[PDB]
């Protein structure tokens, strides 16, 4: 009744909602699902009822009458008297960013190159850099100008997965859950990192967050944000420094949808559940923290401070903005006005 039921995508997910949900008594429980699109059909059946989304997701739960509830926001010098919960949201840079001892490779020679992508219909990771590229280059044929990649989503026999090394035992390969080695901002940043791939599309904050000691995992321990290098549109090349000037655009934030029907309730919950486990919340570094997965970004990205009202009441389309919306359209005529399911 006062319950909404999350959907984790994947197992890690499942597992941290499981925590969440004994944490809560069970005023939150949990829906599984392998991938992103599932959970949305899951949210549309009546059978879950919200999840946090990137915004390429966003626009694919709109068209099918999702709405957005709340929008995660991370920490800004910027209206830092208001509350987070009333402060507007800022957006994020979406990058390109290569290792500095890859001399020469600018943006104008991607071409034939190796790229990490967070996964296919993601905003930095996919509908941003691809959209650029097909506008570049006049062709619909993406899948053509990369020589290899991991796109998790892609097809697993094509070239946009050859880069994909799935899970422990090497099953799952390229699936768009955090199974995959290579998923998601840290998967691909990984993917760079290794050196599997040339160039990475991910988010300004996670370069910031897996160097120069931020992570203690493994492939992070001894990486300095000195040895990358972000690729500009106009060819040049700059320190992650100076990522206000050389990003490819700015990202809404991810941000919990659910059905419209269903909102105004998991709204209520949401607000309370952070309360309690949020960044300074009565149980937070206690006995449990929605915003931790140590690098992970599960369920939430680690960087949130906290889930935000939107104000405005918008639609998926003014909260996604004019901008964002025509570059996927025009990007999604590649691959007509309805519901994918
Ligand atoms: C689960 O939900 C119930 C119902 O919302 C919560 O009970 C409320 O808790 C507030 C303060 O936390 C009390 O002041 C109210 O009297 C309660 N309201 C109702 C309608 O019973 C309960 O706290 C929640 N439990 C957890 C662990 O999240
Ligand atoms: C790129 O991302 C990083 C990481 O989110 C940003 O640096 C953070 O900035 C806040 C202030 O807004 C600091 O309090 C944090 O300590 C910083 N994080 C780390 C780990 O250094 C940086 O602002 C971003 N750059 C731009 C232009 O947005
Ligand atoms: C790729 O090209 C299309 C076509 O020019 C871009 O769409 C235009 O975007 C501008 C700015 O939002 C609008 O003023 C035009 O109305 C749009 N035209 C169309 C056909 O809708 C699109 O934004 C470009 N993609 C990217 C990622 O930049
Ligand atoms: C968080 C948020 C709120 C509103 C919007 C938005 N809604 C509609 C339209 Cl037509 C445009 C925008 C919008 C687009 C870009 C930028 S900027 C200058 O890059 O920060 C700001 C706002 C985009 N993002
Ligand atoms: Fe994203
Ligand atoms: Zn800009
Ligand atoms: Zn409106």
Redesign the pocket.
């Known amino acids: 009744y006062?319950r909404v039921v999350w959907c984790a995508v994947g197992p890690e997910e499942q597992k941290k909602c499981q925590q969440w949900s004994q944490?809560?008594?069970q005023?939150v429980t949990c829906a599984t699902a392998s991938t992103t699109d599932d959970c949305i059909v899951l949210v549309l059946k009546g059978e879950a009822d919200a999840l946090n989304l990137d915004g390429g997701y966003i626009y694919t739960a709109g068209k099918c009458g999702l709405v957005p509830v709340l929008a995660e926001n991370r920490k800004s010098s910027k209206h830092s008297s208001l509350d987070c919960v009333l402060r507007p949201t800022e957006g994020y840079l979406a990058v390109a960013v290569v290792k500095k001892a890859n001399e020469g490779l600018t943006w104008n020679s991607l071409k034939d190159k190796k790229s990490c992508h967070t996964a296919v219909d993601r905003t930095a990771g996919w509908n941003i850099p691809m959209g650029l590229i097909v506008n570049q280059t006049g062709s619909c044929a993406f899948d053509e100008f990369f020589s290899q990649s991991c796109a998790p989503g892609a097809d697993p026999k094509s070239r946009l997965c050859a880069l994909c090394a799935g899970d422990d035992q090497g099953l799952d390969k390229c699936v768009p859950n955090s199974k995959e080695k290579y998923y998601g901002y840290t998967g691909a940043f990984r993917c760079l990192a290794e050196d599997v791939g040339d160039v990475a599309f991910v988010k300004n904050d996670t370069v910031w967050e897996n160097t120069n000691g931020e992570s203690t995992a493994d492939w992070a321990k001894n990486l300095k944000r000195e040895d990358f290098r972000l690729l500009c549109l106009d060819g040049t090349r700059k320190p992650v420094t100076e990522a206000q000037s050389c990003h490819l655009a700015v990202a809404p934030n991810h941000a919990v949808v659910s059905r419209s029907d269903r909102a105004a309730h998991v709204e209520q919950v949401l607000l309370?559940?952070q309360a309690?486990f949020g960044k300074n919340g009565k149980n937070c570094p206690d006995k449990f923290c929605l915003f931790k997965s140590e690098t992970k970004n599960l369920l939430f990205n680690d960087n949130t401070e906290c889930l935000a009202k939107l104000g405005g009441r918008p639609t998926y389309e003014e909260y996604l903005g004019t901008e964002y919306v025509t570059a996927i359209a025009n990007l999604k005529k590649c691959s007509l006005e309805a519901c994918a399911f």
């Open positions: 006062t944490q809560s008594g005023n309370h559940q309690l």
